[PDB]
Amino acid sequence: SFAGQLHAALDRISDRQAAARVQAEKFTLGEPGIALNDVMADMQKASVSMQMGIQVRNKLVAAYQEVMSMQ
């Protein structure tokens, strides 16, 4: 259903952000294996995913309010 799809999308976005954050944490702790050219890319991917999510939320909430304010 729509609720399940939205829940899955939110879980996916949160998982991507958490993975990016933990990779950045591993890089800043000094753990070998990170080259700084992937942490930035992952952070940008998380940011653009969040931007798409908030855009979709804005569109949906605007549509809901304009369809609830009808007569």
């Binding site: 939110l10 879980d11 952000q17 954050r21 969040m50 939320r57 309010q65």
Partner: peptide
């Protein structure tokens, strides 16, 4: 696991629009 702070506050703000109904 738990949702990140960004999505947490996003859903918290979004629910308020549905709150009056």
């Amino acid at each position: 696991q738990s949702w990140s702070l960004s999505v947490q506050t996003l859903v918290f703000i979004t629910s308020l629009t549905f709150l009056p109904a």
